Structure formats: structure tokens, C-alpha cells
Design a protein around this motif. Structure first.
Motif, PDB file in Angstrom:
ATOM      1  N   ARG A  25      49.263  22.453 -91.674  1.00 44.94           N
ATOM      2  CA  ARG A  25      49.614  23.334 -92.777  1.00 44.94           C
ATOM      3  C   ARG A  25      50.977  22.894 -93.287  1.00 44.94           C
ATOM      4  N   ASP A  26      51.036  22.497 -94.549  1.00 42.57           N
ATOM      5  CA  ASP A  26      52.270  22.079 -95.191  1.00 42.57           C
ATOM      6  C   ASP A  26      52.650  23.175 -96.178  1.00 42.57           C
ATOM      7  N   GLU A  27      53.904  23.602 -96.130  1.00 43.82           N
ATOM      8  CA  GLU A  27      54.332  24.765 -96.896  1.00 43.82           C
ATOM      9  C   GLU A  27      55.847  24.746 -96.948  1.00 43.82           C
ATOM     10  N   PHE A  28      56.400  25.438 -97.947  1.00 37.38           N
ATOM     11  CA  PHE A  28      57.833  25.650 -97.963  1.00 37.38           C
ATOM     12  C   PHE A  28      58.257  26.385 -96.703  1.00 37.38           C
ATOM     13  N   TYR A  29      59.363  25.916 -96.109  1.00 37.11           N
ATOM     14  CA  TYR A  29      59.814  26.445 -94.838  1.00 37.11           C
ATOM     15  C   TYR A  29      60.255  27.895 -94.977  1.00 37.11           C
ATOM     16  N   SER A  30      60.585  28.324 -96.201  1.00 37.01           N
ATOM     17  CA  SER A  30      61.056  29.679 -96.447  1.00 37.01           C
ATOM     18  C   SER A  30      59.951  30.738 -96.411  1.00 37.01           C
ATOM     19  N   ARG A  31      58.686  30.357 -96.373  1.00 31.22           N
ATOM     20  CA  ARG A  31      57.625  31.341 -96.570  1.00 31.22           C
ATOM     21  C   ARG A  31      57.353  32.053 -95.254  1.00 31.22           C
ATOM     22  N   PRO A  32      57.502  33.373 -95.179  1.00 36.04           N
ATOM     23  CA  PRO A  32      57.337  34.049 -93.877  1.00 36.04           C
ATOM     24  C   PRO A  32      55.907  33.941 -93.380  1.00 36.04           C
ATOM     25  N   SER A 221      57.807   9.777-101.277  1.00 38.61           N
ATOM     26  CA  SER A 221      58.090   8.919-100.126  1.00 38.61           C
ATOM     27  C   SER A 221      57.775   9.593 -98.788  1.00 38.61           C
ATOM     28  N   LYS A 222      57.716  10.918 -98.740  1.00 36.53           N
ATOM     29  CA  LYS A 222      57.437  11.666 -97.523  1.00 36.53           C
ATOM     30  C   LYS A 222      56.100  12.388 -97.568  1.00 36.53           C
ATOM     31  N   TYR A 223      55.655  12.756 -98.772  1.00 35.47           N
ATOM     32  CA  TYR A 223      54.389  13.443 -98.958  1.00 35.47           C
ATOM     33  C   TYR A 223      53.202  12.590 -98.548  1.00 35.47           C
ATOM     34  N   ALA A 224      53.334  11.266 -98.613  1.00 38.06           N
ATOM     35  CA  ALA A 224      52.227  10.353 -98.360  1.00 38.06           C
ATOM     36  C   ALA A 224      52.032  10.032 -96.862  1.00 38.06           C
ATOM     37  N   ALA A 225      52.472  10.916 -95.990  1.00 33.83           N
ATOM     38  CA  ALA A 225      52.247  10.830 -94.554  1.00 33.83           C
ATOM     39  C   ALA A 225      51.400  12.008 -94.076  1.00 33.83           C
ATOM     40  N   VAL A 226      50.794  11.853 -92.894  1.00 39.75           N
ATOM     41  CA  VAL A 226      50.028  12.941 -92.291  1.00 39.75           C
ATOM     42  C   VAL A 226      50.925  14.129 -91.999  1.00 39.75           C
ATOM     43  N   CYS A 227      52.116  13.858 -91.477  1.00 38.21           N
ATOM     44  CA  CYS A 227      53.135  14.854 -91.148  1.00 38.21           C
ATOM     45  C   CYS A 227      54.225  14.709 -92.199  1.00 38.21           C
ATOM     46  N   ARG A 229      57.612  15.573 -94.252  1.00 38.45           N
ATOM     47  CA  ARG A 229      59.000  15.966 -93.980  1.00 38.45           C
ATOM     48  C   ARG A 229      59.845  15.843 -95.257  1.00 38.45           C
ATOM     49  N   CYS A 230      59.709  16.813 -96.147  1.00 41.19           N
ATOM     50  CA  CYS A 230      60.511  16.903 -97.360  1.00 41.19           C
ATOM     51  C   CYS A 230      61.634  17.918 -97.205  1.00 41.19           C
ATOM     52  N   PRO A 231      62.628  17.912 -98.104  1.00 36.77           N
ATOM     53  CA  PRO A 231      63.677  18.948 -98.047  1.00 36.77           C
ATOM     54  C   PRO A 231      63.056  20.329 -98.226  1.00 36.77           C
ATOM     55  N   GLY A 232      63.200  21.170 -97.213  1.00 38.08           N
ATOM     56  CA  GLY A 232      62.680  22.524 -97.284  1.00 38.08           C
ATOM     57  C   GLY A 232      61.170  22.669 -97.359  1.00 38.08           C
ATOM     58  N   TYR A 233      60.403  21.609 -97.104  1.00 39.79           N
ATOM     59  CA  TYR A 233      58.965  21.664 -97.325  1.00 39.79           C
ATOM     60  C   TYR A 233      58.297  20.637 -96.431  1.00 39.79           C
ATOM     61  N   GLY A 234      57.229  21.034 -95.755  1.00 41.78           N
ATOM     62  CA  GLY A 234      56.482  20.056 -94.982  1.00 41.78           C
ATOM     63  C   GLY A 234      55.590  20.707 -93.939  1.00 41.78           C
ATOM     64  N   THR A 235      55.188  19.874 -92.992  1.00 39.80           N
ATOM     65  CA  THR A 235      54.255  20.296 -91.947  1.00 39.80           C
ATOM     66  C   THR A 235      54.932  21.297 -91.027  1.00 39.80           C
ATOM     67  N   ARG A 236      54.460  22.551 -91.092  1.00 38.85           N
ATOM     68  CA  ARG A 236      55.005  23.677 -90.354  1.00 38.85           C
ATOM     69  C   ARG A 236      54.140  24.106 -89.181  1.00 38.85           C
ATOM     70  N   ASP A 258      62.471  29.062 -86.464  1.00 39.91           N
ATOM     71  CA  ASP A 258      63.770  29.153 -87.140  1.00 39.91           C
ATOM     72  C   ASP A 258      64.046  28.091 -88.208  1.00 39.91           C
ATOM     73  N   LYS A 259      63.000  27.625 -88.897  1.00 45.93           N
ATOM     74  CA  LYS A 259      63.126  26.574 -89.906  1.00 45.93           C
ATOM     75  C   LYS A 259      63.760  25.298 -89.333  1.00 45.93           C
ATOM     76  N   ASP A 260      63.608  25.070 -88.019  1.00 47.59           N
ATOM     77  CA  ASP A 260      64.366  24.046 -87.307  1.00 47.59           C
ATOM     78  C   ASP A 260      63.429  22.974 -86.771  1.00 47.59           C
ATOM     79  N   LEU A 261      63.707  21.714 -87.144  1.00 47.35           N
ATOM     80  CA  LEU A 261      62.809  20.628 -86.772  1.00 47.35           C
ATOM     81  C   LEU A 261      62.760  20.415 -85.273  1.00 47.35           C
ATOM     82  N   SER A 262      63.719  20.976 -84.536  1.00 53.70           N
ATOM     83  CA  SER A 262      63.808  20.801 -83.090  1.00 53.70           C
ATOM     84  C   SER A 262      63.343  22.027 -82.315  1.00 53.70           C
TER      85      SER A 262
END
Length: 274
Positions: A25-32, A221-227, A229-236, A258-262
Motif C-alpha cells: 500500500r503506497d500512500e501519503f505518510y500523513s494519512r491516518p 525516480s522512486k515511483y518506478a520501484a516495487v517499494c 520512497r518519495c518525500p512524504g509518500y510511499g510504501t507504508r 510514527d512516519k519513520d522509516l526505521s
């Protein structure tokens, strides 16, 4: 989003899977969002839930203990209609009602024009009556189709549109399934989580450029991957669903916290189809 699934309604052997599904599921990280757990009148539905105000209770992927499963991907567009109905209700309404998958998608097809672009998979899972998986998207052909057994991929174009990330992801998915064949299901799940976290961009992709127009240029440049990783948006969310020959379901959901990649939390549930 990206979804790969192998369906085999008549498994020729006792340890074969009726369904192996792996989805991002790829989505803006801000979406609850709410992490997956059981809900519904008899606690029979398993899914994560959207919590955006005014759309609460929608979802992108779920399965019920009565054997219903559905999954949605958005169709990439240069622009959106904000007055449109939310797509989150499309999966929810299938999981909570008593309509067969093809009948449901026919109803959806009569209403598809009321939504932004989407792709919808609806499945009836029955150990006794045989599994059925159907597909409809409101940017493709108007009639839902009944899928033949096989391994399918779906991203943000149509079913099986040959975006490079879809073809590359499908090859990784097939390799992981073949590799974890005889092995315990934990190994299969781990291999599929590794596929879903592959960040290798598959470029150039003129199909993505053509469909996404100006909107996708800064993401390409990032959308064309399976996972993604865009600014504020991606595989969640990475979700694996397994249904073995006997109707035992394993549902694994790994969620960004927590919107945190780690920071991630992964939940695995098991149940048997009724």
C-alpha cells in the motif's frame, strides 16, 4: 500500490496454496490509518482501516472468515476529482455483505463513474465450492472478468499492464514462491516481505510517464520501484495473505510507524475458513 497473487483453486497436492498474495500500500505518510485487526459484527473481518476524517472504515485489502477477500489499487492520474466518492468503501462493502464476487463487481461497474480511478479484485474463497477471483477497474473495460488460475500482478495502471516495476516484481515474486516451495510458511512469508521491500527502480518507463503526466515527473525516480520512497509518500504497508489447501489463512501486515522509516510493527494472525 502493487499486488502480486498466485491463485490455484484446485491444488494438485496437499501442501499447495490456494492463494499466495503479497501487496504494498503506497500512500501519503500523513494519512491516518489503523493497523490490521479483526472487526465487524462477529469479529469476522481482518484488515487495516483508513481513518481519514469522513472516510473512516474504508480499506484497501481485507479478508473475512466467511471466505471473502478484496483488494483495491488506485489508477494513476495527472489530476483528481475531490467531489468524487471515496474508493475505500469498495473493499469494505464487499467484505460486509453477502454478494458473490462477480455480482458485486457488476454492481460496482454500473457505479464506477462516481469514483476516481481504481482497480478492484474480489474473491469468493470456498474450500467446498471452489475459489473464484474476479477483476474490474473503472479505467478499463466495462465488464468484470472471471480470472483463470495463474499468477497476476496489479499496480496503478490496469491488471497486468507491463510497467517495468510490475514485470520485475512479478519475477521476484515467482522466484520467492518457487524458492520457499517445500519450506515452512515463515520462510515463504519472509521471502515475500523481502520482495515487497525491493527499492530498485526500473527505468526508463514510458508507460508510467505517459499515464502520470506532469504529476509523476518529480516522483518518477522512486515511483518506478516495487517499494516506493518519495518525500512524504510511499510504501507504508506490506501485506502477505496465504490460504493453504485446507483453508488455513495466514495474514501478515507490516506497517510504518510514527512516519519513520526505521520504525515498523508487523502483526501475523491465523484462522481457518469457515
Amino acid at each position: 500500490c502493487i499486488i502480486f497473487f498466485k491463485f490455484d483453486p484446485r491444488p494438485v497436492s496437499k501442501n499447495a496454496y490456494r492463494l499466495i498474495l503479497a501487496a504494498n500500500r503506497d500512500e501519503f505518510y500523513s494519512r491516518p490509518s489503523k493497523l490490521a485487526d479483526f472487526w465487524g459484527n462477529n469479529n469476522e473481518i481482518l484488515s487495516g482501516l483508513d481513518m481519514e476524517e469522513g472516510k473512516e472504515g474504508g480499506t484497501w485489502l481485507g479478508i473475512s472468515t466467511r471466505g471473502k477477500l478484496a483488494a483495491l489499487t488506485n489508477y494513476l492520474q495527472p489530476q483528481l476529482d475531490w467531489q468524487a466518492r471515496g474508493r475505500g468503501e469498495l473493499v469494505t462493502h464487499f467484505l460486509t455483505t453477502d454478494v458473490d464476487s462477480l455480482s458485486y463487481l457488476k454492481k460496482v461497474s454500473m457505479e464506477g463513474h462516481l469514483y476516481n480511478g481504481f482497480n478492484l479484485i474480489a474473491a469468493d474463497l470456498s474450500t467446498a465450492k471452489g475459489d473464484v477471483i474476479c477483476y474490474y477497474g473503472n479505467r478499463g473495460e466495462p465488464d468484470p472478468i472471471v480470472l483463470t488460475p495463474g499468477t497476476y500482478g496489479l499496480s496503478n495502471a490496469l491488471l497486468e499492464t507491463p510497467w517495468r516495476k510490475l514485470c520485475f516484481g512479478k519475477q521476484l515474486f515467482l522466484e520467492a514462491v518457487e524458492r520457499s516451495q517445500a519450506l515452512p510458511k515463515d520462510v515463504l512469508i519472509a521471502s515475500l516481505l523481502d520482495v515487497l521491500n525491493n527499492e530498485e527502480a526500473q527505468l526508463p518507463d514510458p508507460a508510467i510517464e505517459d499515464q502520470g503526466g506532469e504529476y509523476v515527473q518529480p516522483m518518477l525516480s522512486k515511483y518506478a520501484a516495487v517499494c516506493v520512497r518519495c518525500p512524504g509518500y510511499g510504501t507504508r504497508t506490506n501485506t502477505i495473505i496465504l490460504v493453504d489447501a485446507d483453508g488455513h489463512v495466514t495474514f501478515t501486515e507490516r506497517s510504518m510507524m510514527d512516519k519513520d522509516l526505521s520504525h515498523w510493527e508487523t502483526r501475523t494472525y491465523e484462522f481457518t475458513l469457515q
